[PDB]
Amino acid sequence: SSRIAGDTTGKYTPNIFSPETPMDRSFSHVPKNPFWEAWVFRRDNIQREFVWTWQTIFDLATFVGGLYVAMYATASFCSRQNDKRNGYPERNYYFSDSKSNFVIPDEREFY
């Protein structure tokens, strides 16, 4: 009912007309499951069940926006500390409103 497709000697031929099934690469394929396949389809196509609800908005804002805000605040604090540590004047950052034009320290200058 089965036969060896591969030939090491190099005289490999596909017996497409053989009654016996060739032991080709397809022999080792794993049998799929109707329910697992539908689970895979549902998981990938999860945008269909998306709904804008107050709980969804709350969860999104609290975790994604909340993390982004925390990260920005920490980065701003670290920049302020570094500027104080280095002795540089308050740098003109993008959203910071500073009446100073300092951005890149001069390599020649001694701070």
Binding site: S79, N82, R85, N86, V103, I104, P105, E107
Partner: protein
Amino acid sequence: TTATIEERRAFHKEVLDIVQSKLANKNSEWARPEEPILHNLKSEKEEPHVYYHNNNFRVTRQLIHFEKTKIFEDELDKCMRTHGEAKYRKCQEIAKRFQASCRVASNLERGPNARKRDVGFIYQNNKLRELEKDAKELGLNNPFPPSSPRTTIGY
């Protein structure tokens, strides 16, 4: 300090002369300069020849600094391994020198956003000394520790 356009074009012509003199004789170490091209430009980018030459000088210097730091570390490690338990007293100087080399190498070209590398806690100790002096003279109470004699093996 202001730079007039006449002076800027004069420096540009001098830079071109320097390039022409360099071009006259072949040099395999052209991009490893031993001396910078001195200038008073507001921005080094204005004179491209000065910018590239000085950048190559800075790279050469930094490579030298890194190798010097490695040498200092080797003498500190040998000194530490020879003395034994007397290492703290006898290896204070070598350690001081090694830490100074580390600061010079890191601080020279730290970058626009990088902080100064406080090898040996010298800056922190200095800050604490100033804070103590101010608190004591003004009669304030300092919430910070007083400056330390030694904070590290050397500095």
